[PDB]
Amino acid sequence: SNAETVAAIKTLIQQLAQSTDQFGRAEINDALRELQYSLETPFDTVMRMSLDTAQVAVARIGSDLGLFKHLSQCASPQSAEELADHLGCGRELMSRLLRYMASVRMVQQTDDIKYISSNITQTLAVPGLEAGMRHAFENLWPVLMALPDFLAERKYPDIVDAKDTAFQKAFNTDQDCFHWLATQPTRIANFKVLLTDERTPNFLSTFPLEKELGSWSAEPEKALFVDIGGGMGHACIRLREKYPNQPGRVILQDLPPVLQAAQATLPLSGIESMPHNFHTPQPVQGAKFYFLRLILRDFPDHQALEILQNIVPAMDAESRIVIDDGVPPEKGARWAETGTDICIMSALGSKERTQRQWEELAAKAGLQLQALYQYTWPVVNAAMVFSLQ
Amino acid sequence: SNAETVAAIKTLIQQLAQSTDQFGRAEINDALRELQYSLETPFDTVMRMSLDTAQVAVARIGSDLGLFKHLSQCASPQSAEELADHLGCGRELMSRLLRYMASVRMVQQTDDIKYISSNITQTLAVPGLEAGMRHAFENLWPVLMALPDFLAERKYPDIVDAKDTAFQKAFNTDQDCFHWLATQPTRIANFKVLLTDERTPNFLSTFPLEKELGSWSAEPEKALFVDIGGGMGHACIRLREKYPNQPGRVILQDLPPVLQAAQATLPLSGIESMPHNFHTPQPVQGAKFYFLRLILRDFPDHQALEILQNIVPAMDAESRIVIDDGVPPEKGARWAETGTDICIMSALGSKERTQRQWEELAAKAGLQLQALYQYTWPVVNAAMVFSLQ
Amino acid sequence: SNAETVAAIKTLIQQLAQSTDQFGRAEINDALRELQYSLETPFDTVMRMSLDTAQVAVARIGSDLGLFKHLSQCASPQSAEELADHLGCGRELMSRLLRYMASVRMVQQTDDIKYISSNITQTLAVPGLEAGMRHAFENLWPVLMALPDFLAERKYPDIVDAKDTAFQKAFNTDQDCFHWLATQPTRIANFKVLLTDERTPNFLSTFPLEKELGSWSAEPEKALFVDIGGGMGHACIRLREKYPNQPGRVILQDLPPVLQAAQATLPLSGIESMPHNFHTPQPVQGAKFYFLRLILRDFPDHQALEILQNIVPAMDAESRIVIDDGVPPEKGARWAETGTDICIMSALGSKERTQRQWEELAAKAGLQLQALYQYTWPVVNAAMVFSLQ
Amino acid sequence: SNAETVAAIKTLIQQLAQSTDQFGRAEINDALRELQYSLETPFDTVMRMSLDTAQVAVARIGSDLGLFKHLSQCASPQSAEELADHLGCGRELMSRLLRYMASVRMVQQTDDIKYISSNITQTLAVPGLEAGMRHAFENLWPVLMALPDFLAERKYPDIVDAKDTAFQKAFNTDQDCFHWLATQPTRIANFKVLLTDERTPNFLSTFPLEKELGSWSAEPEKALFVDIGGGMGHACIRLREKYPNQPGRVILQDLPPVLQAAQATLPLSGIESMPHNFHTPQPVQGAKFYFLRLILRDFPDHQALEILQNIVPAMDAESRIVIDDGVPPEKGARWAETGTDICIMSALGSKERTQRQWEELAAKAGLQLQALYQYTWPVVNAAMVFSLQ
Numbered sequence A, B, C, D: 001s002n003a004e005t006v007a008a009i010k011t012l013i014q015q016l017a018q019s020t021d022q023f024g025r026a027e028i029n030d031a032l033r034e035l036q037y038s039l040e041t042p043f044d045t046v047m048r049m050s051l052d053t054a055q056v057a058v059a060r061i062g063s064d065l066g067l068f069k070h071l072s073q074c075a076s077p078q079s080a081e082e083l084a085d086h087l088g089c090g091r092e093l094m095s096r097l098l099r100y101m102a103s104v105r106m107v108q109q110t111d112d113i114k115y116i117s118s119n120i121t122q123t124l125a126v127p128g129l130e131a132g133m134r135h136a137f138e139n140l141w142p143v144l145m146a147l148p149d150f151l152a153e154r155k156y157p158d159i160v161d162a163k164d165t166a167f168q169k170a171f172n173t174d175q176d177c178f179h180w181l182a183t184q185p186t187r188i189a190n191f192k193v194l195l196t197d198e199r200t201p202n203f204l205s206t207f208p209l210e211k212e213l214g215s216w217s218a219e220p221e222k223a224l225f226v227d228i229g230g231g232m233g234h235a236c237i238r239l240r241e242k243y244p245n246q247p248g249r250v251i252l253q254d255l256p257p258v259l260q261a262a263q264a265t266l267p268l269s270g271i272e273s274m275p276h277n278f279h280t281p282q283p284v285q286g287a288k289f290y291f292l293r294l295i296l297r298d299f300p301d302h303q304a305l306e307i308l309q310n311i312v313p314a315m316d317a318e319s320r321i322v323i324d325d326g327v328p329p330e331k332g333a334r335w336a337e338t339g340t341d342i343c344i345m346s347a348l349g350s351k352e353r354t355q356r357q358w359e360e361l362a363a364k365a366g367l368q369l370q371a372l373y374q375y376t377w378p379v380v381n382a383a384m385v386f387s388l389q
């Protein structure tokens, strides 16, 4: 029986996933995608490319209606009629949306054609994660839709400049993304919520802090950790959580509006909030770790170099710059780390960097790689520890 | 070990797939997608929705460059630099595009970082399938992009009008989709290539022609089969191919430009090409089968009703209207027959219809369902045979 | 490919096995055996029945030669010629024996045709497990060999008498098995080594000692636990190990030679060794638990009844008889608790007993079942707690 | 759920088996056995070695009762009581036998504790296959039970002589097996039925007969095929079936009592029955193929050499000797071909031979290997074609 074999496949894959860890499960999920692409028919490939786009649009509609948050708190299955009346949606529109959502597990449909939350419905109800999907719809989609004709019109140039990429055609502006987004309210509110989505796991999973400290001393009043562009300060919070009695200042540096947003969730003491533009010289001198997580990936090498050069003069012999960012391999890179590369090229003019490309960039700033501590698999995120040359 | 487990999963799924038939393989691929969605983390969900739409943009770039047809005819692996200089692409851009395409199997990367065609490469080199991908990019994506705000602005109506749906916002026009397309030369050219893609399997695999015919006589000059909106006439070709000695006229009906495009690939005898607009009265009287394949799905009930009412008066007691189209189930409908529903709502104001919905629509035309012959699984396509009430 | 499929099956089963517990692994191994029997051809069936018994003969040869203990302590692979000359075996015979043992995993053959220990090699080097294999060869096989003609000659009786079953034909004696063994020195020596094999898990993993005890008081000198036929006293040892501060005498009862063999491995204090024949009245009065592990299974109902009737008069209202033994299900019983049934019918005139059969036997002794605490799965071993009626 | 995972394992293994061919299924079955041995606990290993012997004894009882043939023709499940009364067996003995048989799939037990035939019950009802199991019980078992103490008493000699092996101790005789069996009636009747069990597949599956013929001519009256020790003549029957109009005599040679037994099932013409002792010179001169299937494996090299030397003088330049027999590999030999080696060493003093050992034996007879045509996998049976040197 085909159905019996399909059910047994699901049982065995679920059991294998449940027994391994998060990295093993991520490897299984990539394998399932690889198998799907290898087994689909030519017509299936075109159908998948035609229709998988609709998930983001329909997730946007569900978020506009508040469907996912409502469904995630319901204690019993709900009919399409009940959901439509409660959320203020046309009854047959609601039924068609739910049918589509159930077919891509954005909700679950029951045997009496009612609806309950799935793992994805819960995810889309979380404000920082819902903001990621809304960001894909309103910011990434227009840039991806502009890039084929941008490249055609310009005879397929190598994109190297944040002010000359697809973003400018998509949003009909001459400034780079970061400035243009400075001026748009709805954009900024969603961006704001995006900063609250903390990624797991983080570099402290694998970072051998005591080993990297060596005999460095916090006396008299030195800084252990300067989180440059630290956003809501998640790195600082987790550092103090895991090393609560390690001496030394822990300093969150960002722009004033972001630090004001961070105060609500920062600890009452132990973490300093210091306004600092990372395009200016670093004010904290001789810190042990100058930390840049998911900062440099957003800049082409000219601008990423200048961010590092503003830090290097503050370093003493024991100081390290810690770049925590994607480190895709030379070959066999996965879709999450090559898709990111196409999107940041499109929007920001920047790129993902292999380990060799990170080392070449850091060498231009007078820096040498001392250690690399991977903390995610199979997609590579790592804390790279750089010394003065 | 993790790598060993993952490779073993792929070996076993590949072996199970190779041993079933096309419908079994489609069930396996549906299960692999559901497993992927159930096993992904919340961050995975957002990254998948953020990045999967980039595949359509990058397939459109590869199509613009001629990359897939070139790779498909290459006899050895090609370096990124060879492809870049052959195709007129910047070398760094080409390398980044190929890394991304290899990660989603749109090409294959070798272990010395050269590139060869995949199944997907070959698919995207086929003119009609390439055109389906290009249609997704240039026609489906803008309407999906406009749908959320269109729904919000209009307070979530039940869309029933081809001249009042998301299409009008997306392309800033008051025309309905079909009329507007007819004014756009590049778009109509790509649609004509799309008509050359023949779906498989087809209704003749399960349609019991002999039993439906009974003692039906073709004399003096009656038609056995009238293919209304038949495009390239693939249904007429396959009919004549399978039943070459069955008497009766076989008539392809479409608008003049499509009939002209069809002449190259039609048989020299046995199939008549008859210009006919299906919004006007059917000229062929008393035919055995009036055949509508993937036609009525593109019209709201009002207009689909009118198309049937243009045929009904031409029928005698033995005539049948055969609707060959999607018949999704009442529950558990699959993504390829619910995502279509959302797309055709947004572009055409139309919908997919369950069996009960087809029968209700046909009853307003004075017709009753005699038989239903499914020929695809698990996504339902069927030949629905209707007679006068 | 066939080889690839086969290796993938083994990878996936090994991964599933490693992730469950011992009971899950036992269920998997039962399923593998049932799959093997359902998939074998008719000729396979006969070859399996023809050849699988050779493994006991060749394990007995390896034991005679000392091969398994020698291989288990070897630090590198050994050639057949090295093993032959070390162990005193003809070189061709040794090579043929090793080829056979490698094909059933009793050793492992390397790719340069040398030999190393397997899990099974290590098992057969353990004195008590070696003795179980030697017992199968010298005691179980002759009785199984005599059973078919014994049944035929006697017109298929229901065997109920330890002095009238297949044992008497197999060893050409009128004695019952236990008495005859006691006259055979080599056999009794191997049985004494067999007593050193401690089964795991044991009843204390699920026995709720505190709840069964209640407010039971040990003073002035009552016994908490009387281990009747306790062998090496493993139940007493594990009892004292798990509940070292529970007051009350713990008493191992067995015949003098077994108590003497037990002295080496008993604790120096806390467990009394008391010579007692369980076919005679129980000397310890009013103990909390009189414990019979794998005792009553070796006696037909008449004699098992007598053993219980020798204990009952020693009981007070708080005393319990704990029968720790196999409790096979009414249906779906597994091969390891039905093959035992056939063996003990043939050698001892005994039987395995379902829960209902245990309760019927205990009721003739005046006892009622209070509780049943299973501690192995899927083959059922349980501690059955009986009180006076 | 453990049960759910176990059920899914069975479903997936059954589906993989059902889709491959008989050789793929034989590889899967060997893998399942390998997994069982690797996953069992030390106690399980001893239990399996103690109890798997009982299958042959209980199969013997079932055959004595006629249970398997009766159950194989029953049209509905039968209770233990019904079977006991019909077959003349004690009711509780019958119930215990059926419980054991169901646990090793020798029958199947239903959910209402009744019994139906399994694949193994059908196999054991077939007279030639039942005779193989009875042969294992009455002929192979006594020799395997004698071999450990035979080897111990004789200080582990290399066994090379049919008149000095374990057989002589097992059956208290000084003659080799073949003569001693000449004198025992029950033995001979069962042996007789054994000859009717035709193995599948056979060498004609893969033997390129037309290629091996070359330009050999049957004119005037030459023999195509001389089946030496051909038993019931199955090789001759299948040769004429697959090559019904190939010219040349086809001759079955055996001892007179076997050829009289073969007449009932030989074709009415086309196959000659010729009495011939293969220890005498071959009377048919210049045949194309002199065929020896499963003959030489039963003889030590001295006697196997003399059988070949009696054929060689009859050969002309185009004649071939075809040895069809087991050809185990140099390493990694499977249990069916190494267990056979131990049993024929025990009973007959002979051995399985690798390809190199066959070539060494044939070279002593003046013969050279021309071709080897395997026809079973993974256990190697092959037709080896030898020429004059």
Ligand SMILES: C[S@@+](CC[C@H](N)C(=O)[O-])C[C@H]1O[C@@H](n2cnc3c(N)ncnc32)[C@H](O)[C@@H]1O
Pocket: A195, A228, A229, A230, A231, A232, A234, A253, A254, A255, A258, A276, A277, A278, A279, A292, A293, A294, A295
């Ligand atoms: C990817 S986000 C947050 C990255 C942060 N390290 C983390 O892991 O959450 C980039 C951060 O850089 C900050 N940022 C952007 N421009 C900056 C500038 N010129 N100076 C300092 N911070 C800046 C943003 O405000 C935001 O908090």
Ligand SMILES: C[S@@+](CC[C@H](N)C(=O)[O-])C[C@H]1O[C@@H](n2cnc3c(N)ncnc32)[C@H](O)[C@@H]1O
Pocket: B195, B228, B229, B230, B231, B232, B234, B253, B254, B255, B258, B276, B277, B278, B279, B292, B293, B294, B295
């Ligand atoms: C989705 S295509 C289907 C073609 C065909 N039934 C098949 O299965 O391939 C729709 C067809 O309808 C035709 N069509 C659109 N409007 C029409 C009209 N007013 N009258 C006749 N044909 C029309 C198009 O030219 C096109 O060939």
Ligand SMILES: C[S@@+](CC[C@H](N)C(=O)[O-])C[C@H]1O[C@@H](n2cnc3c(N)ncnc32)[C@H](O)[C@@H]1O
Pocket: C195, C228, C229, C230, C231, C232, C234, C253, C254, C255, C258, C276, C277, C278, C279, C292, C293, C294, C295
């Ligand atoms: C199967 S062994 C079981 C030992 C112990 N109950 C255990 O679980 O290991 C049976 C034990 O019963 C003992 N036994 C046999 N006959 C006995 C008798 N008449 N009185 C006391 N013990 C006896 C033997 O010496 C042996 O130690």
Ligand SMILES: C[S@@+](CC[C@H](N)C(=O)[O-])C[C@H]1O[C@@H](n2cnc3c(N)ncnc32)[C@H](O)[C@@H]1O
Pocket: D195, D228, D229, D230, D231, D232, D234, D253, D254, D255, D258, D276, D277, D278, D279, D292, D293, D294, D295
């Ligand atoms: C393994 S059995 C049958 C083998 C046969 N080639 C086949 O594949 O069925 C061995 C055969 O050799 C025959 N045989 C034994 N001694 C013989 C002898 N001295 N001369 C001729 N045939 C003999 C037996 O009668 C029996 O038919």
Ligand SMILES: C/C=C/[C@H]1Oc2c(-c3ccccc3)c[nH]c(=O)c2[C@H]2[C@@H]1CCC[C@@H]2C
Pocket: A046, A047, A050, A051, B132, B135, B139, B140, B177, B194, B297, B298, B339, B340, B341, B343, B344, B347, B348
């Ligand atoms: C020729 C069809 C191409 C694809 O667009 C359509 C259309 C369509 C959409 C916009 C403009 C014109 C027609 C109507 N009706 C369908 O069914 C599909 C499906 C087609 C294939 C992929 C998914 C779509 C929903």
Ligand SMILES: C/C=C/[C@H]1Oc2c(-c3ccccc3)c[nH]c(=O)c2[C@H]2[C@@H]1CCC[C@@H]2C
Pocket: C132, C135, C139, C140, C177, C194, C297, C298, C339, C340, C341, C343, C344, C347, C348, D046, D047, D050, D051
């Ligand atoms: C100490 C037990 C050894 C094994 O023989 C027995 C015996 C037994 C048999 C013959 C003579 C003396 C005792 C009784 N009662 C059992 O239960 C087992 C099982 C034992 C382990 C393997 C399978 C057997 C049926």
Ligand SMILES: [Cl-]
Pocket: B326, B336, B379, B381
């Ligand atoms: Cl479809």
Ligand SMILES: [Cl-]
Pocket: C326, C336, C379, C381
């Ligand atoms: Cl047990």
Ligand code: NA
Pocket: A337, A338, A339, A341, A342, B095, B096, B097, B099, B100
């Ligand atoms: Na890339």
Ligand code: NA
Pocket: C095, C096, C097, C099, C100, D337, D338, D339, D341, D342
């Ligand atoms: Na061997």
